[PDB]
């Protein structure tokens, strides 16, 4: 028994927390990402990068803490602790936003490790690896939003900050500057996510309301046995119900569950494609035909042109505070605004 | 026997290709009415003075909209919450200019979806099923009612109902955020958890079932042909799926009871959507999301910003531009 | 007014949900299938195919 | 050289449900992207 | 409206090409 196989045995033991070879990458990297985020949201400020308090130590709450993105002056520097910026000074590394790349990079490798874990466990137990394939969706989202978008932009500063209100800021920023709602790829993402939720709800309810009478209790949960060979609910009755209610119904269980995988995953992937576009400011910002007609015809108004106006207002009012490194100075009189407001 | 009994037997018949039922006797007319009007208005309706300031907004395709920008525009702010049926307009042109189609479509649609939920119960009763699919359906219905009925009621005008269009939906959302800070409202946070988690659990359940499919096909044909409609035998190995998942996270976090698993799949998104519907319905009464603007002060008393202040800047930018000609007085109360 | 209106709209909705839950359950229990479909007498199995 | 029948050839299938699903997908993609194609 | 001059042809082909792909495959099925 060579040392490699002895290690393989130890790593793949049946214990409370399976480790596996993938655990070597997953657990330290996941721990770094999670502990870095908790440490930043508890203790670390964004005063020097954003001019914002972003930790419990400064009086922020769960909704307003964040591991904020680094200062825009660093471009896409990876901001290693030992790098030319912090130069091994941990306190400075915290103050310049080193925690953001720390968390982002360890999270990316922890995500890799987790998908490798999915593969490893699927191989060990003897099933098909469709869980890893499904997890590719969240991976695409994380790569596109947290890595690809800022890499296309001027710096990590424009990456989403790891915090609740930081994420909301990123969301509103994308609306105002990129008109992300108008983007057909975001639209397909929305459809995928809403359809996934719909499928989850409808499938759970359908199963729960076509159950077979397999027990005597009003509590129907105890009339199932994991080793039972037969279906626990009536696919035939479910199909008839949905055919008569909605017009169509699933008749193939395998297709149903594959569809439940396919919908949200496809949605995540399409929205990731859209975010890649936004990284290069390749927006679906405008419909030129309506823009031209409005520029010539002062009576032409659509909801599209109204949304354009909202975006203009948001940009002008938010940019000075959202981009403090720019030293934007917008005198009050240049701010766009409607009457009386 | 009697003509009425025969009619009853027909309406409640489980042999109709589409179940009608007593709820169907209301659903079908109202839904067809809403659909016909919606199609006609989306294609060809003239512009609507939504803000009541004689500034009509073009919603239909024939007036220069594409599919993304087109909409059935909410009725005029001058109408407010008044009932505006066709017969209360001096002319069809007047009814159209003031946004009557929106009211017609919305009222019929809402009647129809409530009858759809009743019809789901009715058919489950006729088929001897358990009765609670309609309860799951009450989540989307609640959200739709919030955005088309409850919010306009609280705000005092159908002009503030969600427009029946894509870009109109986005406009609704942006203004809603500007006025209520829905992102910082925990019920919307719960709705987001509902939909993100529902999609997560959909992907997880679908993938685990697909992963544990029993070999019944060859590598050439679709594995879907391994399942035959109406078999009792289980088409996948739930114990193998539990083995995998309980090793992915840990044993006691994995369901091994399919009934409890499917109850959880039903309950999670439904509860999340109920909560976000209630969030919209209560922001209808202007009980808004959290306001932490200037919550953090330094020792001298100067405000230290947080991400909430940046969000508020965005909200103000949206607010000052929205309905740019509609406001005469400094506070957007109505 | 905001506190009262919001709270009572939420309570009204959840009691509508409760009404739906209990009305459906009461009907199913009276007809005797609140515990699931009896495999022997699954009603759909005696029903003609839709098309 | 001789021309021998290739024994690797297999039929392809698209069932009616798959047809409806694909046709709906194509129609809804067209609905989505036509406005942007026109700009 | 002054729309992109390739809009109609792009939309028609975007729909028609996959439509005919599906139609061919469906119709020949069972051969």
């Amino acid at each position: 028994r060579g040392w490699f196989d002895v290690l393989d045995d130890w790593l793949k033991r049946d214990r409370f927390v399976f480790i596996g070879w993938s655990g070597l990458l997953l657990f330290p990297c996941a721990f770094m990402a999670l502990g870095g985020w908790l440490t930043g949201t508890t203790f670390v400020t964004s005063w020097y990068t954003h001019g914002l308090a972003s930790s419990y130590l400064e009086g922020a709450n769960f909704l307003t803490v964040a591991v904020s993105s680094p200062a825009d002056a660093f471009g896409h520097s990876l901001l290693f602790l030992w790098g030319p910026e912090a130069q091994g000074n941990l306190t400075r590394w915290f103050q310049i936003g080193g925690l953001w790349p720390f968390v982002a990079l360890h999270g990316a490798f922890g995500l890799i490790g987790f998908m490798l874990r999915q593969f490893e466990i699927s191989r060990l137990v003897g099933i098909r690896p469709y869980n890893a394939i499904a997890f590719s969706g969240p991976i695409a989202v994380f790569v596109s939003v947290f890595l690809m978008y800022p890499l296309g932009q001027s710096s990590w500063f424009f990456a989403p900050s790891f915090g609740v209100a930081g994420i909301f800021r990123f969301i509103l920023f994308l609306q105002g500057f990129h008109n992300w709602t108008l983007n057909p790829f975001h639209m397909m993402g929305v459809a995928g996510i809403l359809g996934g939720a719909l499928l989850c709800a409808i499938h759970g309810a359908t199963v729960e309301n076509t159950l077979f009478e397999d027990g005597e209790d009003s509590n129907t949960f105890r009339a199932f046995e994991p080793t039972q060979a037969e279906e626990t609910y009536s696919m035939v009755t479910a199909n008839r119900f949905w055919s008569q209610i909605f017009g169509i119904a699933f008749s193939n269980k395998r297709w149903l569950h594959f569809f439940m995988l396919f919908v949200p995953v496809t949605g995540l992937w399409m929205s990731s494609v859209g975010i890649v576009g936004l990284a290069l400011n390749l927006r679906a910002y405008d419909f030129v035909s309506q823009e031209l007609r409005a520029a010539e015809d002062p009576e032409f108004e659509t909801f599209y042109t109204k949304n354009i106006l909202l975006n203009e207002g948001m940009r002008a009012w938010m940019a000075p505070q959202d981009q403090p490194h720019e030293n934007f100075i917008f005198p009050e009189e240049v701010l766009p605004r409607g009457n009386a407001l | 026997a009697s003509l009425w009994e025969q009619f009853c037997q027909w309406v409640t018949s489980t042999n109709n290709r589409i179940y009608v039922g007593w709820f169907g006797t209301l659903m079908i007319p109202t839904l067809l009415t809403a659909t016909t009007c919606f199609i006609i208005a989306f294609i060809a309706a003239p512009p609507v003075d939504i803000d009541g300031i004689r500034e009509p907004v073009a919603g239909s395709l024939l007036y220069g909209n594409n599919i993304i920008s087109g909409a059935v525009v909410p009725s005029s702010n001058a109408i407010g919450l008044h009932f505006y049926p066709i017969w209360e307009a001096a002319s069809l042109d007047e009814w159209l200019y003031n946004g009557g189609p929106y009211q017609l479509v919305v009222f019929h649609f809402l009647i129809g979806i409530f009858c759809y939920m009743g019809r789901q119960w009715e058919l489950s009763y006729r088929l001897g099923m358990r009765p609670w699919i309609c309860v799951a359906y009450s989540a989307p219905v609640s959200a739709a009612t919030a955005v088309f009925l409850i919010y306009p009621i609280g705000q005092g005008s159908f002009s503030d109902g969600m427009p029946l269009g894509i870009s109109g939906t986005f406009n609704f959302m942006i203004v809603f955020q500007a006025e209520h800070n829905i992102l910082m409202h925990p019920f919307h946070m719960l709705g987001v958890a509902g939909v993100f988690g529902g999609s997560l659990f959909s992907a997880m359940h679908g993938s685990l079932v697909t992963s544990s499919l029993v070999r019944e096909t060859t590598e050439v044909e679709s594995q879907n042909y391994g399942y035959k409609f109406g078999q009792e035998e289980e088409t996948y190995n739930i114990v193998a799926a539990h083995g995998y998942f309980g090793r992915l996270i840990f044993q006691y976090a994995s369901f091994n009871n399919s009934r409890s698993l499917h109850f959880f799949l039903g309950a999670w998104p439904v509860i999340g959507i109920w909560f976000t519907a209630m969030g919209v319905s209560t922001m209808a009464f202007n009980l808004n999301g959290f306001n932490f603007n200037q919550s953090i002060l330094d020792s001298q008393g100067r405000v230290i910003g947080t991400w909430a202040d940046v969000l508020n800047r965005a909200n103000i930018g949206f607010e000052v531009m929205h309905e740019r000609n509609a406001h005469n007085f400094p506070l957007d109360l109505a | 007014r905001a506190w009262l209106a919001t709270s009572h709209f939420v309570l009204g909705f959840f009691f509508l949900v409760g009404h739906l839950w209990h009305a459906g359950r009461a009907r199913a229990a009276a007809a005797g299938f609140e515990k699931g479909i009896d495999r022997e007498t699954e009603p759909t199995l005696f029903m003609p195919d839709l098309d | 050289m001789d021309r021998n029948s290739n024994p690797n050839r297999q039929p392809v299938e698209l069932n009616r449900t798959s047809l409806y699903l694909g046709l709906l997908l194509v129609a809804v993609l067209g609905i989505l992207f036509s406005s942007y194609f026109f700009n | 409206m002054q729309v992109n001059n390739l809009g109609f042809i792009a939309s028609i082909l975007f729909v028609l090409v996959p439509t005919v792909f599906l139609l061919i495959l469906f119709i020949q099925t069972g051969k």
């Binding site: 035939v236 199909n239 055919s243 017009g247 169509i248 119904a249 008749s251 | 294609i43 395709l61 024939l62 594409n66 599919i67 035959k228 409609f229 109406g230 | 195919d49 839709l50 098309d51 | 069932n15 009616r16 449900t17 409806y20 046709l23 709906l24 129609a27 809804v28 067209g30 609905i31 036509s34 406005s35 026109f38 | 409206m1 729309v3 809009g7 109609f8 939309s11 028609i12 729909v15």
Partner: peptide, 30 residues
């Protein structure tokens, strides 16, 4: 004339719905 293209795609989608309902593959138990 782009309106014609929008109406065409919308009609195609609705027609697909009608056929998928009316002319569906019957679910059969066997």
């Amino acid at each position: 004339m782009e309106s014609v293209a929008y109406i065409l795609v919308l009609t195609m989608a609705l027609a697909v719905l009608f056929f998928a309902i009316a002319f569906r593959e019957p679910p059969r138990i066997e």
